[PDB]
Every structure is written in C-alpha cells, then in structure tokens.
Design an enzyme around this catalytic site. Structure first.
Site, PDB file in Angstrom:
ATOM      1  N   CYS B 105       0.845  -1.188   0.000  1.00  0.00           N
ATOM      2  CA  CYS B 105       0.000   0.000   0.000  1.00  0.00           C
ATOM      3  C   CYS B 105       0.884   1.243   0.000  1.00  0.00           C
ATOM      4  O   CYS B 105       1.696   1.446   0.909  1.00  0.00           O
ATOM      5  CB  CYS B 105      -0.949   0.003   1.206  1.00  0.00           C
ATOM      6  SG  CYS B 105      -2.185   1.386   1.303  1.00  0.00           S
ATOM      7  N   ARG B 108       0.028   4.706   2.839  1.00  0.00           N
ATOM      8  CA  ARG B 108       0.020   4.485   4.283  1.00  0.00           C
ATOM      9  C   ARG B 108       0.373   5.720   5.111  1.00  0.00           C
ATOM     10  O   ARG B 108       0.339   5.640   6.345  1.00  0.00           O
ATOM     11  CB  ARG B 108       0.968   3.341   4.656  1.00  0.00           C
ATOM     12  CG  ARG B 108       0.426   1.960   4.336  1.00  0.00           C
ATOM     13  CD  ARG B 108       1.473   0.900   4.637  1.00  0.00           C
ATOM     14  NE  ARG B 108       2.475   0.774   3.568  1.00  0.00           N
ATOM     15  CZ  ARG B 108       3.579   0.031   3.666  1.00  0.00           C
ATOM     16  NH1 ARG B 108       3.814  -0.640   4.786  1.00  0.00           N
ATOM     17  NH2 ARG B 108       4.442  -0.048   2.647  1.00  0.00           N
ATOM     18  N   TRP B 277      -9.386   6.031  -0.804  1.00  0.00           N
ATOM     19  CA  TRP B 277      -9.664   6.691  -2.069  1.00  0.00           C
ATOM     20  C   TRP B 277      -8.628   6.229  -3.083  1.00  0.00           C
ATOM     21  O   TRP B 277      -7.566   5.720  -2.721  1.00  0.00           O
ATOM     22  CB  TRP B 277      -9.663   8.223  -1.938  1.00  0.00           C
ATOM     23  CG  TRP B 277      -8.464   8.818  -1.262  1.00  0.00           C
ATOM     24  CD1 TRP B 277      -7.248   9.097  -1.840  1.00  0.00           C
ATOM     25  CD2 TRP B 277      -8.357   9.229   0.110  1.00  0.00           C
ATOM     26  NE1 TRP B 277      -6.399   9.650  -0.905  1.00  0.00           N
ATOM     27  CE2 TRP B 277      -7.056   9.744   0.296  1.00  0.00           C
ATOM     28  CE3 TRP B 277      -9.234   9.212   1.198  1.00  0.00           C
ATOM     29  CZ2 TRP B 277      -6.612  10.233   1.526  1.00  0.00           C
ATOM     30  CZ3 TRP B 277      -8.797   9.712   2.421  1.00  0.00           C
ATOM     31  CH2 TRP B 277      -7.491  10.205   2.575  1.00  0.00           C
ATOM     32  N   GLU B 282      -4.418   3.629 -10.748  1.00  0.00           N
ATOM     33  CA  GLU B 282      -5.207   2.411 -10.569  1.00  0.00           C
ATOM     34  C   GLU B 282      -6.346   2.339 -11.579  1.00  0.00           C
ATOM     35  O   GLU B 282      -6.612   1.278 -12.160  1.00  0.00           O
ATOM     36  CB  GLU B 282      -5.770   2.347  -9.150  1.00  0.00           C
ATOM     37  CG  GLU B 282      -4.781   1.959  -8.068  1.00  0.00           C
ATOM     38  CD  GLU B 282      -5.470   1.838  -6.708  1.00  0.00           C
ATOM     39  OE1 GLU B 282      -6.013   0.757  -6.395  1.00  0.00           O
ATOM     40  OE2 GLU B 282      -5.468   2.839  -5.965  1.00  0.00           O
TER      41      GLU B 282
HETATM   42  C1  HEM Z   1      -6.514   6.401   1.786  1.00  0.00           C
HETATM   43  C2  HEM Z   1      -5.995   6.299   0.552  1.00  0.00           C
HETATM   44  C3  HEM Z   1      -5.364   4.991  -0.004  1.00  0.00           C
HETATM   45  C4  HEM Z   1      -4.716   4.903  -1.175  1.00  0.00           C
HETATM   46  C5  HEM Z   1      -4.447   6.056  -2.168  1.00  0.00           C
HETATM   47  C6  HEM Z   1      -4.279   3.537  -1.365  1.00  0.00           C
HETATM   48  C7  HEM Z   1      -3.568   3.065  -2.455  1.00  0.00           C
HETATM   49  C8  HEM Z   1      -3.240   1.751  -2.706  1.00  0.00           C
HETATM   50  C9  HEM Z   1      -2.709   1.217  -3.943  1.00  0.00           C
HETATM   51  C10 HEM Z   1      -2.419   2.038  -5.214  1.00  0.00           C
HETATM   52  C11 HEM Z   1      -2.521  -0.093  -3.795  1.00  0.00           C
HETATM   53  C12 HEM Z   1      -1.974  -1.035  -4.886  1.00  0.00           C
HETATM   54  C13 HEM Z   1      -2.959  -2.168  -5.154  1.00  0.00           C
HETATM   55  C14 HEM Z   1      -3.011  -2.432  -6.632  1.00  0.00           C
HETATM   56  O1  HEM Z   1      -2.212  -1.820  -7.383  1.00  0.00           O
HETATM   57  O2  HEM Z   1      -3.862  -3.247  -7.066  1.00  0.00           O
HETATM   58  C15 HEM Z   1      -2.931  -0.451  -2.450  1.00  0.00           C
HETATM   59  C16 HEM Z   1      -2.896  -1.700  -1.873  1.00  0.00           C
HETATM   60  C17 HEM Z   1      -3.362  -2.040  -0.621  1.00  0.00           C
HETATM   61  N1  HEM Z   1      -3.993  -1.194   0.272  1.00  0.00           N
HETATM   62 FE1  HEM Z   1      -4.037   0.864   0.147  1.00  0.00          FE
HETATM   63  N2  HEM Z   1      -4.693   2.811  -0.265  1.00  0.00           N
HETATM   64  C18 HEM Z   1      -5.371   3.656   0.597  1.00  0.00           C
HETATM   65  C19 HEM Z   1      -5.940   3.266   1.800  1.00  0.00           C
HETATM   66  C20 HEM Z   1      -5.928   2.005   2.365  1.00  0.00           C
HETATM   67  C21 HEM Z   1      -6.629   1.577   3.571  1.00  0.00           C
HETATM   68  C22 HEM Z   1      -7.538   2.499   4.424  1.00  0.00           C
HETATM   69  C23 HEM Z   1      -6.357   0.270   3.761  1.00  0.00           C
HETATM   70  C24 HEM Z   1      -6.814  -0.686   4.889  1.00  0.00           C
HETATM   71  C25 HEM Z   1      -7.305  -0.282   6.063  1.00  0.00           C
HETATM   72  C26 HEM Z   1      -5.469  -0.158   2.693  1.00  0.00           C
HETATM   73  C27 HEM Z   1      -4.942  -1.427   2.531  1.00  0.00           C
HETATM   74  C28 HEM Z   1      -4.300  -1.919   1.408  1.00  0.00           C
HETATM   75  C29 HEM Z   1      -3.837  -3.281   1.201  1.00  0.00           C
HETATM   76  C30 HEM Z   1      -3.984  -4.421   2.229  1.00  0.00           C
HETATM   77  C31 HEM Z   1      -3.272  -3.354  -0.014  1.00  0.00           C
HETATM   78  C32 HEM Z   1      -2.619  -4.582  -0.690  1.00  0.00           C
HETATM   79  C33 HEM Z   1      -3.602  -5.721  -0.919  1.00  0.00           C
HETATM   80  C34 HEM Z   1      -4.293  -5.508  -2.233  1.00  0.00           C
HETATM   81  O3  HEM Z   1      -5.243  -4.688  -2.282  1.00  0.00           O
HETATM   82  O4  HEM Z   1      -3.886  -6.164  -3.224  1.00  0.00           O
HETATM   83  N3  HEM Z   1      -5.237   0.920   1.869  1.00  0.00           N
HETATM   84  N4  HEM Z   1      -3.355   0.702  -1.819  1.00  0.00           N
HETATM   85  C1  LIG Z   2      -8.193   0.730   0.220  1.00  0.00           C
HETATM   86  C2  LIG Z   2      -7.637   0.849  -1.172  1.00  0.00           C
HETATM   87  C3  LIG Z   2      -7.376   2.091  -1.717  1.00  0.00           C
HETATM   88  C4  LIG Z   2      -6.866   2.174  -3.010  1.00  0.00           C
HETATM   89  N1  LIG Z   2      -6.606   3.383  -3.564  1.00  0.00           N
HETATM   90  N2  LIG Z   2      -6.640   1.051  -3.715  1.00  0.00           N
HETATM   91  C5  LIG Z   2      -6.885  -0.168  -3.205  1.00  0.00           C
HETATM   92  C6  LIG Z   2      -6.602  -1.404  -4.032  1.00  0.00           C
HETATM   93  C7  LIG Z   2      -7.834  -1.837  -4.828  1.00  0.00           C
HETATM   94  C8  LIG Z   2      -7.833  -3.340  -5.123  1.00  0.00           C
HETATM   95  N3  LIG Z   2      -6.675  -3.696  -5.960  1.00  0.00           N
HETATM   96  C9  LIG Z   2      -7.099  -4.260  -7.261  1.00  0.00           C
HETATM   97  C10 LIG Z   2      -7.475  -5.740  -7.186  1.00  0.00           C
HETATM   98  N4  LIG Z   2      -6.392  -6.493  -6.539  1.00  0.00           N
HETATM   99  C11 LIG Z   2      -6.645  -7.940  -6.573  1.00  0.00           C
HETATM  100  C12 LIG Z   2      -6.337  -6.026  -5.156  1.00  0.00           C
HETATM  101  C13 LIG Z   2      -5.789  -4.611  -5.215  1.00  0.00           C
HETATM  102  C14 LIG Z   2      -7.390  -0.292  -1.921  1.00  0.00           C
HETATM  103 CL   LIG Z   3      -9.542  -1.127  -8.371  1.00  0.00          CL
END
Ligand code: HEM
Ligand SMILES: Cc1cc(N)nc(CCCN2CCN(C)CC2)c1
Ligand SMILES: [Cl-]
Ligand code: HEM
Ligand SMILES: Cc1cc(N)nc(CCCN2CCN(C)CC2)c1
Ligand SMILES: C[C@H](O)[C@H](O)[C@H]1CNc2nc(N)[nH]c(=O)c2N1
Ligand SMILES: C[C@H](O)[C@H](O)[C@H]1CNc2nc(N)[nH]c(=O)c2N1
Ligand SMILES: [Cl-]
Ligand SMILES: [Gd]
Ligand SMILES: [Gd]
Ligand SMILES: [Zn+2]
Lengths: 402, 401
Positions: B105, B108, B277, B282
């Site tokens: 992520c 963070r 958000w 993405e």
């Molecule tokens: C608040 C603005 C946030 C932004 C801009 C953001 C952005 C991102 C991005 C760009 C990814 C890459 C995933 C991909 O490319 O498919 C990611 C992954 C991830 N985010 Fe964040 N995120 C945010 C908030 C959060 C929150 C609130 C949580 C959990 C409480 C979180 C948990 C995760 C986790 C566990 C992953 C990796 C697992 C997955 O989705 O594949 N994120 N995030």
């Molecule tokens: C909380 C949050 C914010 C953000 N901006 N982006 C994400 C990721 C969205 C899911 N992606 C694509 C599918 N993939 C399997 C998992 C990761 C999560």
């Molecule tokens: Cl998405």
C-alpha cells in the site's frame, strides 16, 4: 519448483531451472531484498570447473563421451599441477554467451546467441590492451549498425595482479564539480573524472566531454589513453516536431559498453572483459536524461513545452518524459544508429522467456530491472511473474580498483 | 541489519524492524519470488500476548497496572472459551496496524486516520447489508472520501464464516458472448456468472454495477442490490479532447476491498471490508488499459489520430497519459477524492522517513509501491526497500466456493 503466472494471458509455468541455482542471493524467508542494487582452495575451483565442462559438452551433443571425460581429467590434472587451468577457445566462446544468457537484469537476451567474442587473453601491456579496446569499439559500432561483442583479457591468476579498466563504460561523459555546488556534465561520473584529472588528464568544461580511459596492467598504476574522436560515434538529439529541442544541445553516444564487471567461467575469473550491445531508448531518454541525479532535464523540457509545472496532477512530468524518449528514438533513427524502444524490447524478451522455458525449464529474471522505467504496465513483462537467481557462467559486480 | 540506500540522494538507513517478521515470505537464498502476486491447539496465546504488549507500548503503558491486568483476562478467556474478545480500542489499534503493515500500500501516510466500524455482533446477511451500506455512505461522504473499515465477527470453530463473495464492494459486470469474449469488466466474469446463478437478472452494458453476494455462517449466499444513489460514480471526460466524453467511460468513487482476511492478535476476521480513495493510475492505467481489463488503449489512440503502425512512435505512452489526465480531471471536477501517482509516491517517501524514526523501518513491496506508469519519474523508484510480514496484517484467503 516455483509456479509462475502471466496475468495478461492466464499462462502458468514452473521454473525447474531455478533448482540448479548454485550461488546464493540476498533474500531469506524472513525478508526479501530483491530491490537492492548491489546485494553482494583447489577443490572448490574443481567443482565449478567440472560443472561448466559438463555444460559445454551438453551443448555440443557429446555428454558422457571420450572427449568429455578426457577434458574432465585434464582439468583436474592441471589444477593439481598449477592451481588453475586454461579454457579452450570454443569453451571461452560458449562461456561468454552463457554469461550473457544468464544475466537476470538484461532485457536484451533474445540476442544472447549472437555475440562476437574477441580473445585477448594473450594481452601483454596496457598499450596492447588499448589497441584491443579500440578494435572492439570499431567493430561493435560498425558505422551505426551495431554488433554485439565482448573482448576477454587475461584471467586472474596467482602471482600477478589483475588487468582492470577503471572506467565503468568505454564511453562516458565527464562530470566536473562546478564553481558553486552544481555538476557540469554527468554527475554519475564525478569520481572517474577526478581520477582521470589526478592522473594527468587535461579536463574540458562542457557537458558532453568524452572521458579518457584509465587502463591497468598487472602490478602497474593505471595509464591514461585518449579515445580518437572519430572512434566515438555520437548522436545529436533533436525532436521530430519540437524544433526548439535541438537548441538544448543534448547528445548521447551510440555504444553501450560495460567495462567494470567480472566475467566468471567454470571457476576462472576475468576481471577485465568489456561487453557491448545497443541501447534501449529508455536508458537514455528516461534514466540518463531525466533522473534527478543525472542530467535532470525534465523540468526544463516541460517549461519549454508550455506545460503547467505548478501542480502534479497535470502530469507534466509524464508528458515531457514521453517527448524526450520520442526525441531519442527519432534522433538515433535519423542518424542510422541501432536503437530499440521499450515496447519492442519487452516483447522480444517475452519470446526469450518462452524460448528458454522449452530449452532449460525457466529463465532467471529480475522483474524490477526488466520492467521499463516509463509505461511499465503497458509492456507485457509487467504482467509476467519472474524468478530471480544466479547461474554460472556469469557477469558479476566487483569492487573499484582504487 | 539490511542496509537500505536511496540512490537519488545517497542516504543510507538500516532496517532494524525486519527482525520482528512473524510470517515467512516466499524467497530463499536460492531464488527470489518477490514478483509473484499470490504465493501458492493453544498457540493462539503467543500471538495474543504479543499483540497486547504492542498495544500497551504504543500507549506508553508497558509494565504497569492496566497492562498487567489485560494480560490476565486474555489468559482466562482462552482457558475458559478457547479464544478471546478484543476491547474496542484494541480492535481499532489492530485495524490501523494492519493497514500500517500492508507492504503493497502506497497510501500508508494516512494510516493513523481510519474509522473503525464494529460489526462484531452481526448475525445475518440482512445485518451485513445494512452494515455495508452504512460504511459505503459514510466512506463516500458525497465525494469527500474518508478511510473506513467495518469488522464482522471473528471466525470460531464448528461454525461457518461471514464472507463477502465479491472482491470489492463496487464491481462492474463481465458478460460472455456468442463468441466467448467479454463486454464489461473481464476481471469480474466469474462473480458476474455467480450473481446470475443466484437469481440476478443480468444487464446488457459495459458498466453495470454488480449486486452483492453476502454469506452469513452456514447459510448459502444471498443476493443484495446496492442502492444506485449509494454508488457514486464519475463519468469520464478530458479537459481538451472533447470526443473523450463520447467514449462512454466511467469509474466508481469508492475503492473498497471486501475479500481479504484481517488477522489481529491471533484472531481471524474473514469479513472486514476496508476503503480509502483511489490513486489515479489504478483507474487510468491498470483498470482501463490492462490488456486483460477494459483494454481501451488502442481506441483512445485512434481517436487522437496517433500512428498505431509503429511501436516507436510511443503512441501507447501518449494515449495512456491522456487517459490518466481524463481520470484526474473528471474526479476533481466531480469533487471526488483522488490522488495522482506523483503526490502519492512523494507522501510515501515522507511515510518511510516517519517510520524510520518511529519503528526503525517499514515493510515495502517495491514492485507494488512504484506506479505502473512513469516509474522512475517518482522518488520511490530510486529507494531500496525491504519486504517482510508483520502482525496485525491483511492477508489473502481462499475463495469461499
Ligand atoms: C486512503 C488512501 C489509499 C490509497 C491512495 C491507497 C492506495 C493503494 C494502492 C495504489 C494499492 C496497490 C494495489 C493495486 O495496485 O492493485 C494499495 C494496496 C493495498 N492497500 Fe491501500 N490505499 C489507501 C488506503 C488504504 C486503507 C484504508 C487500507 C486498509 C485499512 C489499505 C490497505 C491496502 C492493502 C492491504 C493493499 C494490498 C492488498 C491488495 O489490495 O492487493 N489501503 N493501496
Ligand atoms: C483501500 C484501497 C485504496 C486504493 N486506492 N486502492 C486499493 C486497491 C484496490 C484493489 N486492488 C485491485 C485488485 N487487486 C486484486 C487487489 C488490489 C485499496
Ligand atoms: Cl480497483
Ligand atoms: C544487444 C542489445 C542489448 C540490449 C537492448 C540490452 C539491454 C539492457 C538493459 C536495458 C539493461 C538494464 C541496464 C540499466 O538499466 O542500467 C541491461 C543490463 C545488462 N546487460 Fe544487456 N543489453 C544488450 C546487450 C548485452 C550484451 C551483449 C551483454 C553481455 C555480453 C549484456 C549483459 C548485460 C548485463 C550483465 C546487464 C546487467 C549489468 C548492469 O547494468 O548492472 N547485455 N541490458
Ligand atoms: C551491454 C549493455 C547494453 C545496454 N543496452 N545497456 C547496458 C547497461 C548500461 C550499464 N548500467 C548503467 C547504469 N547502472 C550503473 C548499471 C550499469 C549494457
Ligand atoms: C532502488 C532500485 O532498485 C533501483 O533504482 C533500480 C530499480 N530498477 C532498475 N532497473 C534498471 N533496468 N536499471 C536500474 O538502474 C534500476 N535501478
Ligand atoms: C507479475 C507482477 O508481479 C504483477 O503483475 C504485479 C506487479 N506489480 C503490481 N503493482 C501493483 N500496484 N498492482 C499490481 O497488481 C501489480 N501486479
Ligand atoms: Cl548508460
Ligand atoms: Gd513544431
Ligand atoms: Gd477526426
Ligand atoms: Zn526476494
């Protein structure tokens, strides 16, 4: 054996070749250190030698024959007698190609079989060394139709020092620490520039001054050698529709020739063995010209393009970088100097992985170096999982000799 | 202690936090598997004990009365019942830690600002839907997005799980043809035909929002149709390419992952949706331009009259940048929270520095932190990173069918 998925197509393969990886990398089950740039006795020499000999005899469809076991016993007798051994000429050609084939951070390995191997293992002096190098540059450049080559200088051996090329590449631009804090020229080359000067080179003061060579014969201080200008083919940089781009005065050289890596074949070590191919445009367009710690031209180009640089969300950085890469490609094509864009290079790397899957059951690849620095997921290698490991023969990094 | 270098500036740090790695990754000295997406009884007390000390040191209350006290009740709760319950504050603290620990992520820097909705007294799929609807409306907040997580009951033996079958709370349909290929989102072809199986009358378009399939313990799933006014979406236009609007493209406001398992102090929550958000790449780069996703890159390039006949014209690169421009522009014009990959990576570099002084390092997954366009134009490209697995954590989990 690790299972590897391609996410664009759905394909799945298993890298059985990784299980043959002999030397170790930096990762553990505790933590992955893949992103780090530089991660890192007669019987051990023997075991590496035996394996490479096995490799060579496998490649010539003669595994387990008379000649094969003949060479095995021959090598051990030579190690027992002299502590080392000598490669036959064909073994050296094969080992140099495998070293390229085995290099995990090279996207151009579809070409690994087409390599011109110059055998300079008889080299005697720094002066002969330089003559061999000039011939290498001349053959590889080939008036802009570039040919892949390597020149192999004498191997490390007990009793005598190493041949070394102190320069990191055969062609490099000077980097002069300025009057204030800035650098004029290439900041990546401030150190070698200072060493050339320290060794009696008369510096210039432009941004694209080709460096002299510092060449080290065994148990000798390095010697300075100037490259004749007509040997170093360069490309002035222009843009097909931005006519002001020519007024930036930017240039780059034709030949990418890495000269500071160590070539390892069957336990033997060649600390001087420069190799060259041709450029992929992103190395020049994106990294060399746009890295903040390199020529760092991105803002100046974006201002000239009339982009709005006060806010990130206009994507002015992305737009200016794309035109800088267009300019590099247009300019090399105009000059008739070989160049490959990141889309064609990654697509031919995909054929290499498929070719290598059938040939050897896998392919060592360093995802972070394979995926281009712009437009990553637009290339098919982005969506390819990869397994990174070390095979021998190999090109390894080594310490600077100063 | 791993040496970590930043190649843009030349600075060096050491990752002392990597020593605490609970679960083991997929790499060995023999080979690196960092680029792979998914890799292939009383010991609950160990993980519970460790999480409690984590809580109390974080509130500067190690080695004192309340800390001593709480260590005993978790001891007795497991002894009597075989598990334990989290105090509300601990559930909050453990949710923020799991986010903080997510190596992939890039957002963070926001980990301290998380709204934790406690749905642990949930009892049916109907209650789920109302929880998920409160979350969605709260997180969306009319386009001023707010990070939020809803936490459904923890798993326990002899009884089925709460599971959301959809991977996200908002997903577009993917429909097969009289010729195999897909209209809509190809990533959702499976769940789409699952929803149809369980009674959903399918739509015909390329952007039909799917119904939810919520699954209370030991009862098969149940279809739920999201209120259309609750699903905030952004029609896509471009600031200067007037025909871009005509392409009919849209995306939704709320990225809310609903298929991951939250683990805190040995407790496992198979249903714990979290939302933030979007970062604009993405949507603009992966969702719309991946060849196995909406695959629109050539259609935009035709409209821009680009030379698609040679790869060296970089027509793909140009078209992709404008698609990202259209995403950022549309979201800002709609007053929906979005962040571009330059702002996002620069905030992450600040996060790394904060984490270095506070905890001695930060688990980061280079291949996922670096954006999918313009990688080396962002500072994270030039930053060496160390990937490892700390608890609390979000983990992937099997599919409940
Ligand atoms: C608040 C603005 C946030 C932004 C801009 C953001 C952005 C991102 C991005 C760009 C990814 C890459 C995933 C991909 O490319 O498919 C990611 C992954 C991830 N985010 Fe964040 N995120 C945010 C908030 C959060 C929150 C609130 C949580 C959990 C409480 C979180 C948990 C995760 C986790 C566990 C992953 C990796 C697992 C997955 O989705 O594949 N994120 N995030
Ligand atoms: C909380 C949050 C914010 C953000 N901006 N982006 C994400 C990721 C969205 C899911 N992606 C694509 C599918 N993939 C399997 C998992 C990761 C999560
Ligand atoms: Cl998405
Ligand atoms: C023929 C066309 C070639 C192309 C297009 C090509 C492309 C590339 C690129 C883009 C990189 C990453 C470099 C960087 O980002 O700095 C690389 C690395 C490398 N290449 Fe190739 N290359 C070619 C030829 C060769 C040859 C002929 C050899 C050896 C015989 C070779 C061996 C290597 C090695 C050892 C590395 C990693 C060294 C390093 O940069 O750290 N390459 N190559
Ligand atoms: C033979 C060859 C062809 C090519 N196209 N490119 C290369 C790599 C250039 C060297 N790199 C520079 C930056 N970095 C310090 C690592 C070394 C080599
Ligand atoms: C820190 C990071 O690993 C470093 O900047 C790497 C990333 N990937 C790279 N990839 C290539 N091809 N060349 C490079 O110099 C780098 N640099
Ligand atoms: C094969 C490769 O590891 C895979 O496509 C990864 C690479 N990096 C990624 N990075 C992000 N942010 N999201 C992704 O889905 C991926 N996919
Ligand atoms: Cl270079
Ligand atoms: Gd013009
Ligand atoms: Gd037109
Ligand atoms: Zn690794």
């Amino acid at each position: 054996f690790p299972r590897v998925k391609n996410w664009e197509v759905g394909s799945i393969t298993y890298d059985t070749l990784s299980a043959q990886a002999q030397q170790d990398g930096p990762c553990t089950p505790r933590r992955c250190l893949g992103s780090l740039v530089f991660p890192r006795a007669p019987e051990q020499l023997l075991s590496q030698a035996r394996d490479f000999i096995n490799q060579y005899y496998s490649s010539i469809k003669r595994s387990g024959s008379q000649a094969h076991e003949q060479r095995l016993q021959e090598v051990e007798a030579e190690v027992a007698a002299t502590g080392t051994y000598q490669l036959r000429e064909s073994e050296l050609v094969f080992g140099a190609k495998q070293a390229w084939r085995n290099a995990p951070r090279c996207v151009g390995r579809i070409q690994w079989g087409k390599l011109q191997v110059f055998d300079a293992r008889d080299c005697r002096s720094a002066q002969e060394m330089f003559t061999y190098i000039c011939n290498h540059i001349k053959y590889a450049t080939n008036r802009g139709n570039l040919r892949s080559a390597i020149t192999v200088f004498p191997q490390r051996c007990p009793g005598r020092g190493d041949f070394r090329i102190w320069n990191s590449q055969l062609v490099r631009y000077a980097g002069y620490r300025q009057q204030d804090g800035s650098v004029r020229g290439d900041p990546a080359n401030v150190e070698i520039t200072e060493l050339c000067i320290q060794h009696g080179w008369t510096p210039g003061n432009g941004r694209f001054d080709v460096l002299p060579l510092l060449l080290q014969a065994p148990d000798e201080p390095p010697e300075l050698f100037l490259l004749p200008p007509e040997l170093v083919l360069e490309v002035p940089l222009e843009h097909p529709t931005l006519e002001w781009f020519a007024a930036l005065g930017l240039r780059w050289y034709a030949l990418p020739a890495v000269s500071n890596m160590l070539l390892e074949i069957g336990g033997l070590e060649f600390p001087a063995a420069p190799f060259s191919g041709w450029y992929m445009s992103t190395e020049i367009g994106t990294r060399n010209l746009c890295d903040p710690h390199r020529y760092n031209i991105l803002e100046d180009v974006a201002v000239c393009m009339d982009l709005d640089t006060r806010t990130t969300s206009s994507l002015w950085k992305d737009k200016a970088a794309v035109e800088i890469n267009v300019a590099v490609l247009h300019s090399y094509q105009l000059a008739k100097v070989t160049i490959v864009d990141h889309h064609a290079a990654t697509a031919s790397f995909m054929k290499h992985l498929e070719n290598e899957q059938k040939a050897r059951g896998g392919c060592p690849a360093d995802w972070a170096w394979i995926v281009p620095p712009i437009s990553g997921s637009l290339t098919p290698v982005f969506h390819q999982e990869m397994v990174n490991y070390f095979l021998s023969p190999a090109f390894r990094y080594q310490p600077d000799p100063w």
